[PDB]
């Protein structure tokens with residue numbers, strides 16, 4: 065068996081890594097990373113997390129299994145971050161949360177739940193989107209279709225082309241929205257647009273699936289769910305997949321959740337059971353450590369105070385780099401307007417460079433970036449900003 | 461969309477615990493648990509585990525992602541544990557290990573790998589088996605078929621019906637073997653019987669899949685891998701799904717591995733990349749905490765020393781409760797020979813009790829058992845042994 069299995073193709077983001085740690089020549093800049101890096105270039109453990117991990121060390125008495133849905137307090141804190149402090153969704157008891165292995169595991173259990181219990185046969189994702197959205201939905205047996213999103217010329221949300229591509233989508237199709245900090249584009253709808261899409265979605269019959277992986281990195285924790293909260297205001301049913309990988313620095317402990325809301329509680333209880341059946345045939349029940357660290361910090365006023373300040377300085381660093389990048393491009397002599405970098409959100413933006421420009425940048429040296437011209441702004445430091453900008457100007 | 465989604469039935473194992481908690485009776489006994497419980501009735505955190513968690517607390521500088529296959533020495537260590545330190549499979553670089561969320565996770569990853577890359581279509585599981593076996597394989601789109609195993613009349617392995625049901629069972633069918641401590645019977649093949657099944661497995665063309673959830677709980681760490689090792693001597697190809705939930709008491713940190721062995725190095729690397737492609741569309745990369753704890757313990761000779769003793773104490777406690785159960789039973793008047801209980805391994809046995817006697821023990825007494833009559837011997841203490849045997853003697 066296996067004698068003739070063909071290799072899997074190299075995961076585009078994930079293959080640049082080894083080319084980088086193989087280059088080993090001097091002042092290399094890797095901007096194809098998917099994680100936050102500080103001014104040192106390190107991805108530290110938040111000290112709010114180090115303080116909650118020692119409370120757990122000293123307080124845990126069992127590593128017995130968690131329920132299929134995970135830790136209760138985890139679920140409740142997630143519903144308050146997503147829908148806000150006193151919403152009807154929470155008080156009417158219309159939402160159920162299964163703690164999950166990361167934002168990806170959330171996507172995948174929604175997908176198995178949806179493939180196995182509904183008539184959904186499609187999901188519309190944006191062009192472009194995180195590459196792995198096509199593969200997780202596809203591995204569940206769903207067809208993924210692409211709506212338009214980006215304007216390659218003006219560097220914006222081509223709203224008129226997104227509405228228009230979306231008009232081909234039928235009722236009972238799921239449409240996938242990135243809740244804030246769009247990967248790879250960083251371009252996000254205004255509240256006025258989110259409300260347009262909300263209303264259009266009610267009347268055309270889409271099921272909304274929000275993927276909320278960077279809450280806190282564009283504007284702020286609540287501001288960032290303004291979009292999800294306008295859909296939630298008017299939808300009877302919707303699904304939200306989130307991740308605490310980026311805002312808690314908890315990448316490898318696999319921390320995310322998958323929230324179901326339905327019209328009332330007895331329906332969402334009946335549907336969450338089939339969601340829970342999906343989890344049990346997948347990994348049985350979730351990793352406790354990282355979700356325990358998330359629920360400890362969010363449950364306690366002192367730790368949550370320190371965490372919000374750690375999320376704030378990460379947000380503010382990215383914002384300082386976006387600004388310091390288009391100013392250094394200006395004074396080192398760039399002949400294109402990069403102002404648009406300042407209008408986009410979170411760690412990613414398309415620099416607007418050609419495939420052959422990113423290949424020459426890497427080979428004629430030093431700057432590594434995703435072949436799409438995607439650049440992670442958190443890989444820039446005041447120290448490497450001038451050699452990086454040096455090289456981008458030298459290839460324009 | 462979720463309006464007419466139907467409930468999903470009570471999980472056989474899971475749903476009993478509620479019934480118990482919620483019964484609020486006096487001296488009640490729960491033998492429907494699936495975790496080790498000590499003499500006092502609790503599932504503690506191993507001392508060696510708590511020492512590696514302080515080591516990690518003090519030493520981790522980042523929670524940046526793990527590769528798709530997780531921690532390398534985690535993988536090296538489980539290959540030596542499974543196949544012994546000088547195995548040709550290791551020296552010839554014929555096996556690849558991916559770290560997964562638990563043994564359930566390992567089994568869903570093998571299933572998605574087989575279902576979407578291979579031609580498998582069928583996997584044969586013993587009758588009876590752990591009930592969630594059928595659900596992980598069915599969720600990936602594979603038929604599960606049953607082979608006979610257990611003789612109710614003599615309480616043994618009737619090898620003749622097992623060998624006879626694995627006939628025909630087409631070349632290229634998957635056959636799942638519990639490596640040691642068969643759940644639910646505790647009935648295991650002898651080394652002559654493992655060697656016969658190995659020989660008949662290469663004659664016939666089957667793909668063996670070992671579920672290895674309890675290594676160390678029958679007669680030893682190494683004694684318990686003789687079966688697998690007897691197949692691994694003769695096969696070109698083999699999959700192993702192991703869990704570190706029980707022998708390390710790390711139930712909820714989801715620690716398990718999925719090992720692929722193919723006939724040589726180049727084939728396992730081409731087949732393992734499609735395995736990684738299956739992982740990446742599921743949860744993307746594995747929970748780091750529980751597996752970091754298993755690699756710190758197994759790679760530090762001091763800690764490994766304390767752990768093997770902790771593991772040994774748990775094996776011996778279960779061996780004592782098995783003797784103490786048939787003894788107390790013979791003294792309280794027990795009408796039937798229960799000596800077979802001592803012949804079986806690990807934490808489970810079928811008590812040989814009727815669905816109606818199992819409800820008699822719950823409704824009239826405090827004894828909770830799964831309706832198959834499966835009891836977990838680790839839920840017995842020197843203390844409750846005699847109220848428990850008085851109740852089953854009353855229903856015989």
Ligand SMILES: Cc1ncc(COP(=O)(O)O)c(CN)c1O
Nearest residue numbers: 166167168194247277307309320
């Ligand atoms: C848009 C998006 N969705 C999901 C994920 C996956 O999140 P996680 O790392 O929590 O699995 C990411 C992160 N790579 C993402 O950017």
Ligand SMILES: Cc1ncc(COP(=O)(O)O)c(CN)c1O
Nearest residue numbers: 562563564590643671673703705
């Ligand atoms: C035979 C068998 N296989 C796999 C598993 C799953 O182990 P885990 O809880 O680590 O996923 C168990 C335990 N429930 C088991 O008994």
